[PDB]
Amino acid sequence: TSTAIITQPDVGQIAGYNNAMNVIYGQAAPKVSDLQETLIGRFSSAFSALAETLDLTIEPSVKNQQLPLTVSYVGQTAEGAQMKLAQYIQQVDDKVNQELEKDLKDNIALGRKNLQDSLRTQEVVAQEQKDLRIRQIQEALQYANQAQVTKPQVQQTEDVTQDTLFLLGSEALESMIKHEATRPLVFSPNYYQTRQNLLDIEKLKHAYRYVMKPTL
Amino acid sequence: WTSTAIITQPDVGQIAGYNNAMNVIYGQAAPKVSDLQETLIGRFSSAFSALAETLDNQEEPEKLTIEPSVKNQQLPLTVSYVGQTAEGAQMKLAQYIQQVDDKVNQELEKDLKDNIALGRKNLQDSLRTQEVVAQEQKDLRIRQIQEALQYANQAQVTKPQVQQTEDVTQDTLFLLGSEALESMIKHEATRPLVFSPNYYQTRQNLLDIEKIHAYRYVMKPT
Amino acid sequence: WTSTAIITQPDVGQIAGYNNAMNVIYGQAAPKVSDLQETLIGRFSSAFSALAETLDNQEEPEKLTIEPSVKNQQLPLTVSYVGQTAEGAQMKLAQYIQQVDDKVNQELEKDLKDNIALGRKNLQDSLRTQEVVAQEQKDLRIRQIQEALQYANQAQVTKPFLLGSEALESMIKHLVFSPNYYQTRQNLLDIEKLKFDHAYRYVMKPTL
């Protein structure tokens, strides 16, 4: 018979994960502490399932506190039951790992997706805006030609809106049309950061801690 | 002869220094001072369970004990060691507690550099990101300016056309005239970035980052 | 001769004070009432368990006991004392309960001093911080004038809600806080004007 005591993973054992949930989720990513709980929960559940398929021991000790956890195997040698326990633990620390990889993926992908949809709605609005303005500039060039405002007659800038664009004068008005192709699209600060979130996400590529390694 | 001590979670004063750290490192993300009392004492009892597990596993055992003093309460904990002499169950118990109180302090200093590293990556990110957002905000404003300079050149405007002067779009920019728009692109490398107040808080928080007591005795050993 | 009693955590009314006190220090980081109650009776049963540990290790041993009453945590708590006489046993039990209650009240003063220290030197931190933000903003507005200066030395020199761009207009040119700041400041005189003005209650006062 061999015994080990294992508790929730420490931060430097999950930092990589926690940072990943952070990039993706941000001010609503789960607290590191609230994650340690989740992982070690996943371990015991799985370890327990490894025990029922063997009819291995999972229980708290100390008596009335979830953590830590005491585990044991009943073998056929000191050397025998020790490593037999080591190898049934690690193999649970793989199943849960594989379960995470397959969760990270579904979270990245739903992240990716949502950011992309947001980018490509800003990028559509920005275009419909630029174009709408190009139409009102063209129509204002006509009004300004028919009334010979050839140079800007603005007393103050509050007066210049769509619907009063011809105040700018037929000349400058010619110029904004002439150069229509180099007038930048206008994007939110939100656009640039969403875009930067999307970059940081697209660059993303353990479950317990041994308080006592198994015994002789 | 059995020696006996009762230990519980360390109180608020005690671990205020450690509480302080975790408040730096994490925002309103940092755990309640209660939750950190728990983690600390829980940490100790765990290293203690390990000490007892192994004491029971020699040629000659030694019987070290830990269990909730009162049944059905997580909260106060009772430890006992079973010795040969009287005074020699009580110097033994107390040392095995000081032996764990040292081990935990070892585990703790490592976990603290970890926490730092991760609160620090967490932040350098949010700075860099906010740096990029503000530099592109600026560069877009500069392309707008480069653009309106053409409009002004073509309309031969060199000097401000406006008396009362409140807020400017891509259309109205050229009213500042080409002498202003031009020196502006000349001095774009010095136009100051505008940031969210959160940017300054975050920045100080990183500055701050670059700056014991697992338990308390309710009764010493006996 | 065995006397028994049944104690549990203090009622909400009994902790109105202590509870608000924590609320004034901690705002909304302050623990639920339920968690405070459990923490006080928690302090009590520890002091009591330490008395039981010691009375037993006397040359002439006294037997004091504490245990859950039901299937709960407390539930409430059953405490007993075993005495030479009836009168003795009941009286000695009620004398010990109250002695423990007194020791704990005294831990509970240090405790409040600590929480208040925690509450204050978090609030000062938040002012240390709105101040640095407010200075950073003021430094910026100052750079946004130093720049609008280079531009206006394109001969503007005099003066046709400014902004980085139309601050061009003039030349001849060139500490303020959120109300939250005056909110934080006020929750710092509320606290620190706040003094020590129940650690359990009786389901069943000590018996025969």
Closest CA of chain C from B55, distance in Å: 24
Identify the CA nearest to C78 among candidates C89, C68, C86.
C68
Collapsing DSSP to helix, strand or coil, B65 comes out as: strand
Residues 73-132 of A with CB under 8 A from B: none
Q: Please list every residue in chain B whose beta carbon sits closer than 8 Å to the beta carbon of residue C27.
A: none
Closest CA of chain A from B41, distance in Å: 11
- Separation between Cα atoms, residue B19 and residue A99, nearest integer Å: 34
Q: Which residue has the tokens 């999972």?
A: A58
How many H-runs (helices) and E-runs (strands) does chain C carry?
A: 4, 4
Closest CA of chain B from A10, distance in Å: 7
Q: Where are the alpha helices (DSSP H) in C5-153?
A: 16-26, 33-56, 86-152
In B, minimum Cα distance to A176 occurs at B151
Best residue in C123, C151, C159, C161 to probe B by mutation, most B CBs within 10 Å? C151
CA angle B220, C60, C95 (to 5 degrees): 75
In C, minimum Cα distance to B35 occurs at C31
Domain covering B1-222 in this structure, CATH number: 3.30.1890.10
Tell me if chain B has a CB within 8 Å of the CB of A171. yes
Q: How far is CA C116 from CA C20, C43, C53, C123, in A?
A: 12, 19, 33, 11
Which residues in chain A have their C atom more than 2.5 Å from the N of the next written residue, marking a break after them? Answer: 55, 205
Class assignment of domain A1-216? alpha beta
- Separation between Cα atoms, residue C51 and residue C44, nearest integer Å: 11
Identify the CA nearest to A110 among candidates A49, A34, A184, A201.
A201
Closest CA of chain A from B126, distance in Å: 10
Collapsing DSSP to helix, strand or coil, B62 comes out as: coil
- Show Cβ contacts of residue A199 under 8 Å, excluding neighbours closer than 6 positions: none
Decide if C46 and B218 are in contact by the 8 Å CB cutoff. yes
Q: Please list every residue in chain C whose beta carbon sits closer than 8 Å to the beta carbon of residue B18.
A: none
Identify the CA nearest to C135 among candidates C168, C170, C181.
C181
Q: Please list every residue in chain C whose beta carbon sits closer than 8 Å to the beta carbon of residue B34.
A: 31, 35, 39
- Separation between Cα atoms, residue C41 and residue C76, nearest integer Å: 10
Written as one letter, the residue type at C58 is: Q
Best residue in C110, C154, C156, C170 to probe B by mutation, most B CBs within 10 Å? C154
- Separation between Cα atoms, residue B220 and residue B79, nearest integer Å: 10
CB B37 within 8 A of CB C135: no
Of all helices (H) and strands (E), which one includes residue B80? strand B77-82
Tokens of B63: 């019987």
- Which chains are adjacent to chain C, needing at least 3 Cβ pairs under 8 Å? B
Tell me if chain C has a CB within 8 Å of the CB of B72. yes
CB A59 within 8 A of CB A26: no
Decide if C42 and B160 are in contact by the 8 Å CB cutoff. no
CB C36 within 8 A of CB B208: no
CB A43 within 8 A of CB A208: yes
Tell me if chain A has a CB within 8 Å of the CB of B165. yes
CA angle B96, B102, B107 (to 5 degrees): 125
* Distance between first and last Cα of chain C: 8
Q: How far is CA B36 from CA B10, B20, B21, B68, C21, in A?
A: 10, 11, 12, 19, 21
Best residue in A3, A176, A180, A208 to probe B by mutation, most B CBs within 10 Å? A176
Decide if C143 and B192 are in contact by the 8 Å CB cutoff. yes
Closest CA of chain C from B80, distance in Å: 11
Decide if A157 and B165 are in contact by the 8 Å CB cutoff. yes
Q: How far is CA B116 from the centre of its chain?
A: 6
- Rounded to 5 degrees, φ, ψ at C204 are -155, 105
Strand A209-212 with A57-59, pairing: unpaired
Q: Please list every residue in chain B whose beta carbon sits closer than 8 Å to the beta carbon of residue A32.
A: 26, 118
CB A6 within 8 A of CB B49: no
Per domain, the residue ranges of chain C are: 1-208
Of all helices (H) and strands (E), which one includes residue B68? strand B64-68
- Rounded to 5 degrees, φ, ψ at A31 are -55, 145
In B, minimum Cα distance to A166 occurs at B171
Question: CB atoms < 10 A from the CB of B154, how many?
Answer: 18
Tell me if chain C has a CB within 8 Å of the CB of B169. no
Written as one letter, the residue type at B96 is: Y
Q: Please list every residue in chain B whose beta carbon sits closer than 8 Å to the beta carbon of residue A189.
A: 133, 137
Written as one letter, the residue type at A124 is: V
Return the percent helix, strand and coil in chain B, to nearest 5.
Answer: 60, 10, 30
Q: Which residue has the tokens 């002067």?
A: B165
Residues 51-70 of A with CB under 8 A from B: 61-65, 67-68, 70
B164: DSSP letter? B
| DSSP secondary structure of chain A | -EEEEEEPPPHHHHHHHHHHHHHHHGGGSPPSHHHHHHHHHHHHHHHHHHHHTT--EEE-SSTT-S-SEEEEE--SSHHHHHHHHHHHHHTHHHHHHHHHHHHHHHHHHHHHHHHHHHHHHHHHHHHHHHHHHHHHHHHHHHHHHTTT--S---SBGGG-STT-GGGG-HHHHHHHHHTGGGSPP---HHHHHHHHHHHHHTT----SEEEE----
- Separation between Cα atoms, residue A129 and residue A186, nearest integer Å: 9
Method: X-ray
Count of pairs with CB atoms under 8 A, one residue in A, one in B: 159
Residue A69: strand pairing partners: A6
Cα-trace Rg, chain B? 32
- Separation between Cα atoms, residue B77 and residue B66, nearest integer Å: 7
**CATH architecture of the domain formed by C1-208:** 2-Layer Sandwich (3.30)
Collapsing DSSP to helix, strand or coil, B8 comes out as: strand
- Which chains are adjacent to chain B, needing at least 3 Cβ pairs under 8 Å? A, C
Strand A2-7 with A69-73, pairing: antiparallel
Identify the CA nearest to B192 among candidates B117, B142, B126.
B142
C146: DSSP letter? H
**In residues, how long is chain C?**
208
Of B73, B176, B219, the CB nearest to C54: B219
- Which chains are adjacent to chain A, needing at least 3 Cβ pairs under 8 Å? B
Residue A4: strand pairing partners: A71
In C, minimum Cα distance to B220 occurs at C50
This PDB structure is determined at a resolution in Å of: 2.4
Q: Please list every residue in chain B whose beta carbon sits closer than 8 Å to the beta carbon of residue A1.
A: none
- Separation between Cα atoms, residue B201 and residue B194, nearest integer Å: 14
